[PDB]
Design an enzyme around this catalytic site. Structure first.
Site, PDB file in Angstrom:
ATOM      1  N   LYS A 130       0.861  -1.156   0.000  1.00 29.81           N
ATOM      2  CA  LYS A 130       0.000   0.000   0.000  1.00 29.81           C
ATOM      3  C   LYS A 130       0.905   1.214   0.000  1.00 29.81           C
ATOM      4  O   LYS A 130       1.762   1.371   0.862  1.00 29.81           O
ATOM      5  CB  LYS A 130      -0.909   0.002   1.222  1.00 29.81           C
ATOM      6  CG  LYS A 130      -1.866   1.175   1.266  1.00 29.81           C
ATOM      7  CD  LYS A 130      -2.771   1.103   2.480  1.00 29.81           C
ATOM      8  CE  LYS A 130      -3.769   2.245   2.472  1.00 29.81           C
ATOM      9  NZ  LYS A 130      -4.733   2.155   3.597  1.00 29.81           N
ATOM     10  N   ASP A 186     -17.590   2.132  10.433  1.00 30.76           N
ATOM     11  CA  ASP A 186     -17.861   2.264   8.999  1.00 30.76           C
ATOM     12  C   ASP A 186     -17.779   0.906   8.312  1.00 30.76           C
ATOM     13  O   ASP A 186     -17.449   0.834   7.122  1.00 30.76           O
ATOM     14  CB  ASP A 186     -16.909   3.320   8.363  1.00 30.76           C
ATOM     15  CG  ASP A 186     -17.299   3.810   6.958  1.00 30.76           C
ATOM     16  OD1 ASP A 186     -18.508   4.148   6.743  1.00 30.76           O
ATOM     17  OD2 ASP A 186     -16.400   3.874   6.078  1.00 30.76           O
TER      18      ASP A 186
END
Ligand SMILES: COc1ccc(Nc2cc3c(-c4cnn(C)c4)cccc3cn2)c(OC)c1
Length: 264
Positions: free
Chosen positions: A38, A132
């Site tokens: 990432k 979330d």
């Protein structure tokens, strides 16, 4: 192209995803072992954004020893300009997988659910409430689901609409409180994912207008439908997860002692 992380060289096979100032790449080390790296571009990052990425890295590192249901972070390199995180590479995220599948196996649905509970339970133990949760926060890595992130920083989408979001998993207390956020809020979101894995739709998806959808989520008069299914225990789990009152809603520790997770 290739990149270097802590003096180790990785060759890029392809880009898996993107979101904001971050990209994820499928890569190979010298021994031809696959990893996901990432990359976060910190060049245009505000103090708030910086701290969110630092906090996400810190928790990933801390949680490594606590559960294998958390995605592995092997190494990372952080400078003022960028962040590189070397992580295990998954086959696919759960959202992309649910979009493809016509029907899910009952055993697979149960095994994935167990993984989700274990992963979320681990973060809760450390004082983190994701708030979330959605299928895209879950990665399928050789038969098991792993939590990719803690809802602390920027979410990503496979490689496209940068405007795309979903309130389909949002708990009632988060909408009413406009702190009502608690581990119970993640129970509701998990409940919505399991509801999606059982009925092929989220509890409020049929509502087009987003305002009306948010109104239905908090409305006690809007009865969520739980059609009859062969797994009675699964039906009970769903109803316990999707109680609007968070005090009455089941807890993850209780969900881990449930017949649905513990019995064949
Ligand atoms: C839709 O196709 C694919 C989805 C996921 C993967 N694996 C994968 C995705 C990762 C993401 C990430 C990126 N996007 N999302 C949603 C999660 C973050 C961090 C680590 C990851 C490690 N492994 C994939 O590898 C071949 C293909």
């Amino acid at each position: 192209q290739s990149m270097s992380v802590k003096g180790r060289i990785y060759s890029i096979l392809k880009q898996i995803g993107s979101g904001g100032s971050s990209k994820v790449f499928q890569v190979l080390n010298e021994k031809k072992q696959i990893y996901a790296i990432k990359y976060v571009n910190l060049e245009e990052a505000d103090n708030q954004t910086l701290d969110s990425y630092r906090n996400e890295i810190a928790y990933l590192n801390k949680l490594q020893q606590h559960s294998d249901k958390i995605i592995r972070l092997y190494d990372y390199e952080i400078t003022d300009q960028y962040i590189y995180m070397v992580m295990e590479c998954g086959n696919i995220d759960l959202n992309s997988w649910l979009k493809k599948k016509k029907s899910i196996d009952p055993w697979e649905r149960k095994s994935y659910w167990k993984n989700m509970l274990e992963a979320v339970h681990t973060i809760h133990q450390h004082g983190i409430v994701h708030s979330d949760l959605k299928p895209a926060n879950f990665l399928i890595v050789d038969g098991m689901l792993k939590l990719i992130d803690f809802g602390i920083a920027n979410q990503m989408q496979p490689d496209k609409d940068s405007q795309v979001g979903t309130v389909n998993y949002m708990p009632p207390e988060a909408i009413k409180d406009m702190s009502k956020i608690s581990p119970k809020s993640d129970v509701w979101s998990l409940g919505c994912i399991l509801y999606y894995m059982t009925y092929g739709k989220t509890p409020f998806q049929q509502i087009i207008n987003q305002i009306s959808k948010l109104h239905a989520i908090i409305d006690p008069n809007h009865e969520i439908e739980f059609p009859d299914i062969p797994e009675k225990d699964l039906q009970d789990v769903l109803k316990c997860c999707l109680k609007r009152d968070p005090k009455q809603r089941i807890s993850i520790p209780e969900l881990l002692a449930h017949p649905y997770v513990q019995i064949q």
